[PDB]
Amino acid sequence: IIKAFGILLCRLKKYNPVTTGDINKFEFLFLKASYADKHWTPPKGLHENSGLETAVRETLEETGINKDKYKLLNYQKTLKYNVKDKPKETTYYLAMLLNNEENVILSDEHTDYKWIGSHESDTYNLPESLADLLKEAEEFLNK
């Protein structure tokens, strides 16, 4: 079972079109893989040798954002997918930025970053499981 771990990093939206109803004030960091499928995902990476150690290191390497720049919230999820018919699990840990204006620094693994919401799932061509992830995360963040 191949294991990947990432941090689902959220921030507060800088603007809301509507400030009336029950709304989604939050948005998650998504990097666009520079190769192959050009996948959009949260920052993540392969376990080596704690899943959170993995998450924090790969998030650092992938975005330049260290653990001290964000607060790990009490929510997580595991997505199971088969890679070339080999069982894989990716666990994401919700974390919110302390500074809403923290700047993403990409490595050569990605070409683009966007802060998105669960409603933008299809536009970003996210698998139903990552959309589920975003949905649940928003449920948690807005409760």
Author numbering: 5 to 53, 56 to 149
Question: What do the authors of the reporting publication say about this deposited model?
Answer:
The NpnN, Ap4A, Ap5A and Gp4G levels within cells are primarily maintained by Nudix hydrolase superfamily member Ap4A hydrolase (Ap4AH from hereon). PfAp4AH can asymmetrically hydrolase Ap4A and Ap5A molecules produced by PfKRS (and probably by other Pf aaRSs) to ATP + AMP and ATP + ADP, respectively. PfAp4AH folds into a conventional Nudix domain, with four β-strands (β1, β2, β4 and β5) sandwiched inside two anti-parallel helices (α1 and α3).
There are four molecules in asymmetric unit for PfAp4AH-apo and designated as A, B, C and D. The atomic resolution structure of PfAp4AH-SO4 has three SO4 ions and a PEG molecule which arise from crystallization buffer. Global structural differences between apo- and SO4- bound PfAp4AH were apparent upon superimposition. Three major variable regions arising from SO4 binding and different space group packing of PfAp4AH were identified in loop regions L2, L3 and L5 and analyzed further. We were able to solve crystal structure of PfAp4AH in two conformations. These two structures were compared and global changes were mapped for understanding the substrate induced changes.
